[model samples]
Target: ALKTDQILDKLNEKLAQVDRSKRSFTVILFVHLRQEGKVVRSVVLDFNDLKISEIELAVTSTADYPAERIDASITIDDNDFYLVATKETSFAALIEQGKVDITGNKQAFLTLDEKFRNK
Candidate 1:
């Protein structure tokens, strides 16, 4: 299993490689990790000015996050989350199988799907 830091590092690398010149939007992704139907960890990824500017892990639902600006949210367990990170499973497929639950802006989710699908 991949550690949280490892996943964040790889995501940061992928973010840095994006074509910033053509990107100028902001989005927030909330990742909720659960076990036995109970939340174990919550991570928030903040994307702004064409790059992922912040990543907050081990947070709670009521934590002081950019809640008002959240563009998308995804709930998944550790195993499935890791799978998506490692490209072992597609994000869309997971949603289809009900392994992941996504809410909020659909366009923002699609944008993320496109960005990470090739990384």
Candidate 2:
């Protein structure tokens, strides 16, 4: 059961393994982890190029890269992070249950998954 840090540490590595053809488009995901009402972790996904080939992540409140399209800004409680990444539950499920917070381009939210999900 890996945690957020462990999962985020491998984000780039896993991204590299994404199908070569599944590249292009830019989407930014702002991820925050809160514990005891205090945010303990922050990471931003900077995926650029029409190919999504350029991948970078920042573990800070604000990343160095300029904001392009903030696809989704999500605050996830620590407990459900593992479940969040595992896709054992759908985004709607989490959102409905109030396990996470979501506000941003909702379409980007959907497309990002379609673009990245293993087909």
Candidate 3:
């Protein structure tokens, strides 16, 4: 089975292959895997310019996030999150599932997800 760190590392690699011209601003995106309404695993990524400047696991607070930077979070259960990341399930299906939630800029999450999945 694929681990979260491995998935994130792949994401960082994939990030480099995208066109930065589309996104003018940097983003601090939080990805959380929740179980029983509590976060079980998390990864914080700093997407700056054309690469992922940072990746932190077990991040649980906004204190680590930089001030006023474009930020957003996506929370879902571990099983479902694994499914999506492994391409067994679609992010759009999670949207309709309702259990998956987003905080902060919804557009940023959607746009980023779109680019990462399609590009």
Candidate 4:
């Protein structure tokens, strides 16, 4: 039942905690939530210039993305989405178990996991 603004606030707080060294790398992450085979929510996080530049939330599947495209895109069920957002489950483990579907730059995804996961 979390609203998009709540997630954005949480991510902004998390971004502040990212290692200073890692902040220099630029990447965009796209996250999509699906329920009953329909897209329920979508978000695009842009990290650049040593900080989070933007966070875009979409209620539809047809929202326009950046021209550079996303560095990584993840689609997951509502349950797993909450789990990941709450840090109640390991995202890497979920991906390994096929509970999460990911595409695009996997290395970027791994970088995000390493940077944000235990903090």
Candidate 5:
């Protein structure tokens, strides 16, 4: 299973690869799972003029995957990260599923997704 630190590391590493413009934007990701029952919260990692690293919970539970979103005000630095499930889902489940869905700011999402997926 992927630990929270692992997820964060991967996320940051991947995000850093994306090319950014002077304009900043917000990104929203929706993670769906079969189950739900975990802690719901948000986190802000490294923040800079290029990007504002942030994550939010859409649903809380092991059964459900937390919806994650990133907002960047400017460009972004290279980084990697992972989102660890606090409870319920096993590490195997997390590795196997770890489904990520992008909602708002699709362009930004795609840019980030491509970078992460490639990494």
Candidate 6:
């Protein structure tokens, strides 16, 4: 499992079209299990630049993700966005296999999908 700080730092550096001063969003990272009953931790990134509010590892669930070495991805619509990290095979696989879960604003997800379109 990757550290929340490290992952968010990398994500902040690579985020596109997101105005830290205005745009606010959340990220959910799910780490799969390795050995039986040995599941890694998950991370969530949330921030509101104006408010200067930052929350990492915001909410964690007991659900175990699939144990496969991989990276994370982002989804955006127009209003809200989600940055989801997974240990799945690939970004496409996570979505196709239903490993990554997404909710909230739809426009944000669509826009994020285009911006982070596996380039």
Query: Which candidate should be chosen as best, given TM-score against the real structure?
Result: 1
How many clashes would you count in candidate 2? 5
Find the candidate with the highest lDDT and give its number: 1
What local lDDT score does residue 80 receive in model 5, on the 0 to 100 scale? Answer: 14
Comparison by TM-score, 4 against 6, better one: 4
Model 2 residue 60 distance off true place after TM-score fit, in angstroms = 10
Worst 10 residues of 4 by lDDT: 53-62
Report residue 36 deviation for candidate 1 (angstroms).
3.4
Candidates 1 and 4, the one with greater TM-score:
1
Cα lDDT tens digits, model 4, 30-60, are 7776777666667665676334333344322
> Can you give the TM-score per candidate against the true fold?
0.72, 0.66, 0.66, 0.68, 0.32, 0.34
How accurate locally, in lDDT, is each candidate? 0.67, 0.58, 0.65, 0.64, 0.35, 0.35
**How displaced is residue 65 in candidate 5, in Å?**
20
Tens digits of per-residue lDDT, candidate 6, 13-107, equal 55543665655344333223222223333333232221212322322332332223112323321111222422223344446655444444434
Model 4: residues with Cα > 4 Å off, grouped in runs = 1-8, 16-22, 49-64
Candidate 5 error regions (>4 Å)? 22-26, 30-36, 44-115
Model 2 ranges off by over 4 Å: 19-22, 49-69
Q: Which digits, one per residue and each the tens of the lDDT, describe model 2 over residues 4-28?
A: 6555545556666655565565677
User: TM-score of predicted model 6?
Assistant: 0.34
